């Protein structure tokens, strides 16, 4: 079964999400 | 429940980890 690609997606949507929600708040202040 | 499990596991790993060695060198520049 697909896991590889469950667990890339995820981490990267993880990842990829905090990374620019805290990085949106930085650019603001 | 697979799939959902790689998805948590996935994401959590990410962001925490992410989140993680960010706080951790802004902690001590």
Same mark, same amino acid.
């Given at each position: @079964?697909? @896991? %590889?690609? $469950? &667990? %890339?997606?995820?981490?990267?949507? +993880?990842? %990829? +999400?905090?990374i620019? $929600? %805290?990085?949106?708040? &930085? /650019? /603001?202040?």
């Amino acid at each position: @079964e697909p @896991e %590889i690609t $469950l &667990i %890339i997606f995820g981490v990267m949507a +993880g990842v %990829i +999400g905090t990374i620019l $929600l %805290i990085s949106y708040g &930085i /650019r /603001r202040l």
